[PDB]
Amino acid sequence: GIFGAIAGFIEGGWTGMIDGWYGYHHENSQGSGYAADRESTQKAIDGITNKVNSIINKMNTQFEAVDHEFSNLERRIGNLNKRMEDGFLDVWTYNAELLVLLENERTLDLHDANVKNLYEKVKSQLRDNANDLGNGCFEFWHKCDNECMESVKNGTYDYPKYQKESKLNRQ
Amino acid sequence: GIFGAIAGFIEGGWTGMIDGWYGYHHENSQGSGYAADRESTQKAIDGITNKVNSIINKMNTQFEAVDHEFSNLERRIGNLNKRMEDGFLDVWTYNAELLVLLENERTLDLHDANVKNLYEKVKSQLRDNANDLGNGCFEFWHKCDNECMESVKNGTYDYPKYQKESKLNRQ
Amino acid sequence: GIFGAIAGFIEGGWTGMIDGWYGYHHENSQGSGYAADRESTQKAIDGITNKVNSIINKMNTQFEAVDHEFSNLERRIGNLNKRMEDGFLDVWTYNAELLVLLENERTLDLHDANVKNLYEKVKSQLRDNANDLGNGCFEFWHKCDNECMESVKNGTYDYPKYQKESKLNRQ
Amino acid sequence: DKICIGYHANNSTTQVDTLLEKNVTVTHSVELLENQKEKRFCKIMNKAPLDLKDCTIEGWILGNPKCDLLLGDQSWSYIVERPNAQNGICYPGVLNELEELKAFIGSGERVERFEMFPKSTWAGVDTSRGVTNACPSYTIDSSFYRNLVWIVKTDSATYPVIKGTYNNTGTQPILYFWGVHHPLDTTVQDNLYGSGDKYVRMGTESMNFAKSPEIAARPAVNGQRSRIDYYWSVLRPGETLNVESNGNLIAPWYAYKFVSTNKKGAVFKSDLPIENCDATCQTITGVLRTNKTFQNVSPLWIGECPKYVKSESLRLATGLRNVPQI
Amino acid sequence: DKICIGYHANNSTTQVDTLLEKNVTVTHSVELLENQKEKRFCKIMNKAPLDLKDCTIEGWILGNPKCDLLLGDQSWSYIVERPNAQNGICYPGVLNELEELKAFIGSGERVERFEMFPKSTWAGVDTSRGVTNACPSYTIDSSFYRNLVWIVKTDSATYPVIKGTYNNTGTQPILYFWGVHHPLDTTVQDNLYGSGDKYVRMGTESMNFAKSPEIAARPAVNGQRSRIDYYWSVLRPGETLNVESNGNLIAPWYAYKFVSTNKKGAVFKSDLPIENCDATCQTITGVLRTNKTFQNVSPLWIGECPKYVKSESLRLATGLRNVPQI
Amino acid sequence: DKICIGYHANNSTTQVDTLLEKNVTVTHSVELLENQKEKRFCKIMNKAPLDLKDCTIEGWILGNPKCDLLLGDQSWSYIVERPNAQNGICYPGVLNELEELKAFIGSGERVERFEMFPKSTWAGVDTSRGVTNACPSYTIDSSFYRNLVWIVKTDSATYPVIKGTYNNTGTQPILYFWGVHHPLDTTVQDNLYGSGDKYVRMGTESMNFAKSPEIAARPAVNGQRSRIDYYWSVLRPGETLNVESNGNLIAPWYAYKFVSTNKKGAVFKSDLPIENCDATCQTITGVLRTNKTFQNVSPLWIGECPKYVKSESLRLATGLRNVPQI
């Protein structure tokens, strides 16, 4: 992948996480569970939806072929009409097929980047209070309960609060 | 954002920095100020300008409709002309509108990436001689005067020079 | 560059590495040499080849102009034919030229990202057992022989194996 | 104690293609192209099509004696013409500007049949005998177009100058037809129309017409070596038509009040069945009920239809690369 | 001591759309589409347009007696025809291949009026009486086209075979006109042209023409139930025209030296005013003074104009997302 | 001990352009556009073109006496017509629907010449004297089209009604030609065809034709002030043609069995040489031997050719930015 996350340093997806495109899996004394990151997932849904609707809107005109007939002495204008109609048919077929291939590549990259950025968002808060395993997982040097976990997910994680505890356990 | 910098870990822009698209804000004993990174800004200006000029150049042909008239017994070729002219009108309207939407998305991503890369460029030189606050700001473990600041901006920052001073203050 | 690697923090390319697009240069007691990363290079070759073949396939139709003639009293349909043929000529010339400019920009970015991701892949395994020089080079805090080197290249580098040796030498 | 960052996976086997890669399985995607059709004709905006059945366009508006089923007023959302339709021009000859006539009729949504020139209009000549076995009715062997009158001389006399006029005082254009007969030999000419140079001349504010009989023996079609040159025109609102001939005239009898359509017009040549049903998109090869943006069924259609392309599939990725574990 | 990395913000409220997002405020952007026009006609390359005013194209080059203002030499960058122009074909009839004639005239930039056939050319007949109240001049009630001569018999005689010839020895093509008169009855025919079969035959190296009068009573237009069939042609450099008729001839009198344009030709049908001004781009609905790449004013224009599209706005982002603080 | 991550560099100076940057040197790239041609005509699918040489299309299928080299059966992958070809219509006149005829011939791959109407078909008239010095053969000064017969009266007599018929019982359409002569004066008319109204009438199941001579003195071309109106038509399989005239008939003598092509047809107007060679793509300006996707040689071609564009170069980057050190 272009951003190296999806099918990258995070080798695979989670079938267990069904409520979002991106999210978390946590482990602590209260057990383990999956949780979707609501903000990043919704931002992606709105963007992708906007893209689809935009593509549909730009494709919202139609070229209309006609049933008009031409006599034996109208071979030229008859063939003129055919080449025209086939002409626009080839243009729009090209426009549609190329756009789909291009946008699919870019859509997948978008998701890749979002996973990478979500990872970076967590790495940034945790700092040296956690150990980066390289697979998208962080092992805390301190006890992180459910509210500690939730603070990580919503960006309010308190690094100084757990610093010395992590400091002691790390070294 | 795709690169997560603009409206990302750097939450907002600087109205105070008026001389460039990307740059710095420093604080030391001589006070504080804004400074544009001249290299990255100029590279972006040249690229974006090249893109605009390229789009303008590719759009530099015109399809020409005609004022030609058709009699009552020329309904077919009359309608043939109309469908053709409307045909190319729809193609070019599509080409223009889709290209604008696509390029706007990509242009904004370009700026996002440039901010991210500029940040990475500074992070790389400073290493552990500074503290990363996560908001695009670095707090030095050593006194960094105006020439020290300028060396960071132009890439010539001397890490070994300030290492032990930073080392002492950090630990 | 958008990902900041090619002509970025890695200032230039290696003429000495002739067997791949991306790879490594190692130094140890057995000497120095270049080696292409086979996985990332092959993935890129397949992708770029797929892109070229896809572009060729979408361009695999032709608009056909005709040698048909028109009399002095057929100026209108004569001019109708000319504007049509010139019309599709302008459309396809636009389609080809714009696509080439767009894809070239994106192809180069793809390579940039692959170099960045390869760098990240190595940085991740080595951790603090090596020193990042900022130019894409890592200086080991431990002796890394040919099999140690190869383990880095193929992703099986053993961090705990060399940890204390690196630990001692680093501090 | 751990937290991991990751992405959605599911049991999707649906694939997309990208510029860089083919057959990429993704968690979510949308198909933009419609390849399914209902093989039949339905109503468009609750207006039924006109089935010409065993009659062609020519047979219908000329009033071929076997097309009495269609005869009179018609309203249509579009026209269906059957490929093997047998009832066209029965008495051999060319309907001039046929392709322009078809294009014109197609641009209409309604015709109203009225009597434009009653047989009383032609003073000194016979309107009784204009029949031929080339144009059989269902019940009788020798008949003629319901909208035309084949005019021959009274039993013993010489063909005089006949005149007729119609002032179009209504708000609608009038589609009318007429003809010129061309006997195979001078004998038939003299028999039917008498002797002397004959002419058929017609004119309006915007139109002039003049034709003389062209006598020659052409190959037999429907048992006839003679021919009729059929003509059509449109009398605009406010315009007047003047008819003047001293012979060989197939006269306009009934004509049509013509209502031109606001929308796109269509004439479908097909064997498909017309059923009792509604549709917003009608293709020549069937009905499309879809909200999809693209279609690969046919470029020929009426109503609000998706854009026609040659593609088999146009599927956009919406979700991400599907990498389920283990 | 601190250093921060960041990006530009300003007070811009200008927005763009992207595939992913609508209404994105950006610090810098450029509008590529021009929606503004000067509602008037100006000169193109310092060459003024030709205002036909109250005359139509037909009225102008046929030399309608009320179009004397336009009569003679003209040069034009383009042609402006007024929608309600009253002075066209005054004596009722059809100008044949009218649409091709308009297309041809449009491809020109200059005409030079000269006398092609002086009235002396027609030996045994009268050129004095070719007037009609259907074609009034401004000062007199009964006149005729300045470029044509309606030829009738001398007061008492029979219409003879008249002949005329013109050898085009110049380097320019010649646009000329002629006609065939069609009296409403045989009386008017015999009165004006006498008795016997009449013909109008004309020919060059590349053209043949032959027409006979077609006599019939058509609806009255401008007080006339008769008609003229008007014709036009182009005599190429080096070619010679031969005129031969024994009656019913509306003869070519004046013709035009025709200069075809290198550039694109245009005929604008509009009520817009022609003012004293210059322009590089002239639209049928107005003038465009812009360096912008796109335009949504009109697809019909002359000169160097931006590309026409249906879009309301085509704004490219150049700057970045505008996120000013606080 | 060190390991570094890096990228390929080489000695390439080949450059590409991007939206963001021009003249970017890359390690690997592919040129998609072909600008090279072989300036000559070759065979297409091992079928040779037809060189008309010094004869034009008209001269060839009319059977101009100087085109005997081409006379008879022909097969072609395409047609090459030389720009200065001198042998066209020798006896002055217009070949009607010339452009449609050229389009039709172009859609064929083979013609087979046969005798459609032997001179025996025309009973009471002379087929011996149909020659003119306007149409010289190579060896003799006065000849005529090989496919036509100029029919005049027997030495002393009056021109009778002549009749001919041909039933097309084969599986191929038949391209045939005929004509109507127009003498410059009534003397030549009376001399050749005698006195009285003359006609040429022809008809099939789907076609009617009727023409009368139009006598007038037109400018001299190839020493002739008279004219012939040449006509063409296609007799469909199963159809029958009936010929009837009492004078002025240039009769059909030889005709062509016509084989329409499955593929695209082409008529190239060029001075380029036809050599002994094969090609899969033949352009009007030369041969293209390439696997490239695009071409800027010409939009006019036959066979499997790359897409024509106006571009000078279309080079895709495949490798990366080339940054060799030092």
Ligand SMILES: *[C@@H]1O[C@H](CO)[C@@H](O[C@@H]2O[C@H](CO)[C@@H](O[C@@H]3O[C@H](CO[C@H]4O[C@H](CO)[C@@H](O)[C@H](O)[C@@H]4O)[C@@H](O)[C@H](O[C@H]4O[C@H](CO)[C@@H](O)[C@H](O)[C@@H]4O)[C@@H]3O)[C@H](O)[C@H]2NC(C)=O)[C@H](O[C@H]2O[C@@H](C)[C@@H](O)[C@@H](O)[C@@H]2O)[C@H]1NC(C)=O
């Ligand atoms: C991101 O996720 C975090 C983690 O869940 C969340 O922070 C928690 O928010 C809840 C509710 O706002 C807090 O619950 C209240 O806590 C107060 C504080 O007392 C305790 O403080 C600390 C917590 O560590 C302890 O050390 C102390 O010893 C106390 O136990 C407590 O007084 C209160 O109890 C009364 O108040 C209730 C009204 O809230 C009342 O209804 C009730 O009857 C009681 O009388 C609650 O128990 C919880 O303490 C927070 N956890 C931490 C670690 O701070 C974030 O929610 C807030 O975050 C702030 C930064 C803002 O962003 C706001 O949106 C929220 O208020 C959550 N943020 C977001 C944006 O989702």
Ligand SMILES: *[C@@H]1O[C@H](CO)[C@@H](O[C@@H]2O[C@H](CO)[C@@H](O[C@@H]3O[C@H](CO[C@H]4O[C@H](CO)[C@@H](O)[C@H](O)[C@@H]4O)[C@@H](O)[C@H](O[C@H]4O[C@H](CO)[C@@H](O)[C@H](O)[C@@H]4O)[C@@H]3O)[C@H](O)[C@H]2NC(C)=O)[C@H](O[C@H]2O[C@@H](C)[C@@H](O)[C@@H](O)[C@@H]2O)[C@H]1NC(C)=O
């Ligand atoms: C990136 O930004 C940095 C920071 O501004 C800049 O480096 C400074 O450049 C200026 C001018 O080149 C230097 O000023 C001269 O310094 C010399 C050295 O003496 C001092 O050296 C160190 C500095 O830390 C001290 O520790 C010593 O005690 C000395 O005080 C000094 O001799 C000189 O004074 C004489 O020379 C003048 C001519 O330059 C002469 O005109 C004058 O009359 C004096 O006789 C200057 O005062 C300044 O010292 C630099 N700062 C540091 C920390 O090194 C970079 O500019 C250079 O960087 C090198 C790496 C190259 O890239 C060149 O482009 C520049 O020469 C700047 N680089 C870029 C690319 O923009």
Ligand SMILES: *[C@@H]1O[C@H](CO)[C@@H](O[C@@H]2O[C@H](CO)[C@@H](O[C@@H]3O[C@H](CO[C@H]4O[C@H](CO)[C@@H](O)[C@H](O)[C@@H]4O)[C@@H](O)[C@H](O[C@H]4O[C@H](CO)[C@@H](O)[C@H](O)[C@@H]4O)[C@@H]3O)[C@H](O)[C@H]2NC(C)=O)[C@H](O[C@H]2O[C@@H](C)[C@@H](O)[C@@H](O)[C@@H]2O)[C@H]1NC(C)=O
């Ligand atoms: C990525 O790159 C690494 C580095 O080259 C490579 O790992 C080496 O693989 C080779 C061959 O598989 C190993 O060679 C054998 O080693 C065994 C183990 O004995 C030694 O183990 C460690 C090594 O550090 C020492 O400390 C011990 O003291 C021993 O010396 C050895 O028994 C064996 O000798 C016999 O076995 C041969 C069959 O393999 C037999 O033919 C021969 O006659 C001998 O009887 C070999 O000498 C080498 O030790 C590996 N190096 C390390 C550091 O482990 C990776 O290849 C493997 O990696 C594993 C993880 C999988 O991915 C497999 O693909 C490979 O088996 C290479 N991986 C990839 C994917 O390319």
Ligand SMILES: *[C@@H]1O[C@H](CO)[C@@H](O)[C@H](O)[C@H]1NC(C)=O
């Ligand atoms: C996925 O699982 C669901 C279970 O509800 C079911 O539709 C089917 O087993 C799977 N669907 C597809 C499309 O594979």
Ligand SMILES: *[C@@H]1O[C@H](CO)[C@@H](O)[C@H](O)[C@H]1NC(C)=O
């Ligand atoms: C791959 O691509 C083609 C197109 O459908 C086909 O051969 C095959 O079904 C696709 N899927 C797989 C898994 O091969």
Ligand SMILES: *[C@@H]1O[C@H](CO)[C@@H](O)[C@H](O)[C@H]1NC(C)=O
């Ligand atoms: C032509 O020949 C066929 C041969 O069977 C015959 O049936 C047909 O009647 C002939 N056509 C004419 C017009 O005689």
Ligand SMILES: *[C@@H]1O[C@H](CO)[C@@H](O)[C@H](O)[C@H]1NC(C)=O
């Ligand atoms: C199209 O119809 C399907 C099925 O009713 C629905 O799921 C989908 O959301 C529709 N698309 C739009 C754009 O409304």
Ligand SMILES: *[C@@H]1O[C@H](CO)[C@@H](O)[C@H](O)[C@H]1NC(C)=O
């Ligand atoms: C931005 O500020 C400037 C001050 O010079 C002034 O144009 C105006 O207040 C603002 N402009 C816009 C476009 O908002």
Ligand SMILES: *[C@@H]1O[C@H](CO)[C@@H](O)[C@H](O)[C@H]1NC(C)=O
């Ligand atoms: C958003 O989009 C539309 C298009 O102009 C309009 O309703 C509105 O003015 C735009 N701007 C804002 C701030 O809503």
Ligand SMILES: *[C@@H]1O[C@H](CO)[C@@H](O)[C@H](O)[C@H]1NC(C)=O
């Ligand atoms: C047709 O009728 C109207 C009714 O007012 C009349 O004014 C007009 O003159 C009539 N037309 C002719 C040609 O008589």
Ligand SMILES: *[C@@H]1O[C@H](CO)[C@@H](O)[C@H](O)[C@H]1NC(C)=O
């Ligand atoms: C177009 O004109 C405006 C106003 O004069 C100017 O600011 C802009 O730079 C021009 N664009 C180009 C491409 O010259």
Ligand SMILES: *[C@@H]1O[C@H](CO)[C@@H](O)[C@H](O)[C@H]1NC(C)=O
């Ligand atoms: C690169 O080097 C090779 C050496 O084999 C040779 O083709 C030439 O010197 C260079 N080629 C180009 C295209 O610069």
Ligand SMILES: *[C@@H]1O[C@H](CO)[C@@H](O)[C@H](O)[C@H]1NC(C)=O
């Ligand atoms: C740069 O672009 C143009 C196009 O070929 C030309 O002036 C020049 O040869 C190119 N290359 C260099 C190195 O300037």
Ligand SMILES: *[C@@H]1O[C@H](CO)[C@@H](O)[C@H](O)[C@H]1NC(C)=O
């Ligand atoms: C026209 O004049 C030229 C002048 O040289 C002459 O050669 C030519 O024969 C003339 N044309 C006719 C038809 O007399």
Ligand SMILES: *[C@@H]1O[C@H](CO)[C@@H](O)[C@H](O)[C@H]1NC(C)=O
């Ligand atoms: C086109 O031909 C060249 C030269 O033979 C070859 O190198 C290239 O691979 C070919 N391209 C394809 C797509 O086969």
